[PDB]
Ligand binder design. Structure first.
Ligand SMILES: [Br-]
Ligand SMILES: [Br-]
Ligand SMILES: [Br-]
Ligand SMILES: [Br-]
Ligand SMILES: [Br-]
Ligand SMILES: [Br-]
Ligand SMILES: [Br-]
Ligand SMILES: [Br-]
Ligand SMILES: [Br-]
Ligand SMILES: [Br-]
Ligand SMILES: [Br-]
Ligand SMILES: [Mg+2]
Lengths: 261, 261
């Protein structure tokens, strides 16, 4: 099974530009055999807002707004499933969300649980929890950007049978590409972190989108500044069986009575 | 304040040789200005038992047994605090434990919660949970080797207020050195992994004892093969403040209602 990230430079407040860019790159990941393609956090709107008004004005509803319908068009046309970061307008309120779409249309969304830094000024903290989406051929967990920092995010996803963690990101700190292999190891899952690149109103993002294996292998890593795709073949049986030797199964060996809440 | 590991080669079934070796190295750590000194998993008995009988015969009671007694003597004479892995006899049961002693006497013990591989044939799973010992001048959390694999181990100790996680280990997998800086980071603690070295009845330990900082920096890492001590200064203020910026505090930011559910 093949999974991909799309690393791209969301132009802030310019969604038609970002659609065009994301279409190009999803098609690229598709041509390379990806059945799952993951885009950055807030790929449509960009990231570094000053006011809520400017993002809210343009943010789209899920699933009926322009970002999701665009992604559905693309999924329909390419036959891939897509996990993509999007500013989600929901009534009066904005979420930093990820939509999941497939060739049959809308699959689901995840709202960023752990808001980072100034996101707290613009976005409501996520309220849907950590969800795993069964695509039939695979179960896809989703978390966004800062979620990587809390091992609980990946853990919750993995415990819920995620084969792959899809991880739209707009990373500013340098730690995530290092931590992601450990998240993948400790849960015995695959992770696909799709980072954006670029400078936005003085803020630079890290690039370094990456795919990580359940043995903490980096199967694919992107540049710091270029828009690109990366793909990796993943072996589902490896992640579905949590044994790490004949006498230890990660999930069976967990002893939650001892884990502080 | 400086903390240290003692990386050593326990000779299986030879506590008196391991005492003398441990004493030598703890004094070294102390001369180097360590106030806290961490020793490997099962430093006194060694690890790779053929049968439960061989370890059961030699395993010492804690605190009244020879291992604790010897460590108390050393703690006193060198003026250091010691965290050390020891096989614990407790009636008919055996635990894979860690003792904590300081210059004035016995502080406490930790019993390995997550048993690895054949340890399940000799030891009972630990039953005292993850404890943090307050030395007055710092709070020392303890976990042992495979415990690192579960992010919950370090998390629990960090949430319980560890400044440092003392981590007696006999690592055989490749992962822990790379994982420990991530554990330090995600918890904003320091970690002191005191691994053993040696090839013991065919099982090869990896060494690479390390002290990781809360910025995921390796402050000291040991060789793969050699017995040695490593010392690093730790900034207590840095770990007692969970702020990662002025809008994010790691512990304030955890959203526990969404975890593992
Ligand atoms: Br536009
Ligand atoms: Br293919
Ligand atoms: Br679908
Ligand atoms: Br939904
Ligand atoms: Br779910
Ligand atoms: Br966790
Ligand atoms: Br000696
Ligand atoms: Br003491
Ligand atoms: Br005790
Ligand atoms: Br291994
Ligand atoms: Br240092
Ligand atoms: Mg909370």
């Amino acid at each position: 099974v093949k999974v991909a990230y799309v690393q791209m430079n969301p132009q802030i407040l310019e969604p038609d530009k970002n659609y065009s860019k994301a279409e190009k790159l999803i098609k690229e990941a598709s041509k390379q055999g990806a059945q799952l393609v993951v885009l950055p956090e807030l790929f449509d709107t960009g990231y570094n807002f000053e006011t809520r008004e400017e993002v809210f004005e343009i943010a789209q509803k899920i699933p009926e707004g322009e970002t999701t319908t665009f992604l559905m068009d693309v999924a329909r046309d390419t036959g891939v499933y897509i996990v993509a970061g999007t500013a989600e307008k929901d009534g009066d309120v904005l979420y930093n969300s990820a939509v999941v779409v497939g060739p049959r249309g809308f699959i689901g969304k995840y709202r960023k649980i752990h808001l980072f830094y100034r996101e707290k000024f613009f976005f409501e903290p996520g309220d849907l929890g950590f969800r795993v989406f069964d695509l039939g051929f695979m179960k896809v967990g989703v978390m966004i950007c800062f979620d990587w920092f809390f091992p609980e995010s990946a853990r919750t996803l993995a415990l819920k049978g995620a084969d792959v963690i899809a991880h739209p990101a707009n990373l500013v700190m340098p730690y995530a590409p290092r931590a992601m292999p450990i998240r993948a190891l400790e849960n015995k899952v695959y992770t696909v972190t799709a980072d954006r690149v670029g400078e936005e109103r003085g803020l630079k993002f890290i690039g370094k989108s990456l795919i990580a294996s359940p043995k903490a292998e980096v199967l694919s890593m992107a540049s710091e500044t270029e828009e690109e795709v990366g793909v990796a073949e993943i072996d589902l049986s490896l992640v579905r069986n949590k044994r790490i030797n004949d006498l230890n199964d990660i999930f069976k060996d967990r002893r939650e009575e001892y884990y502080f809440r």
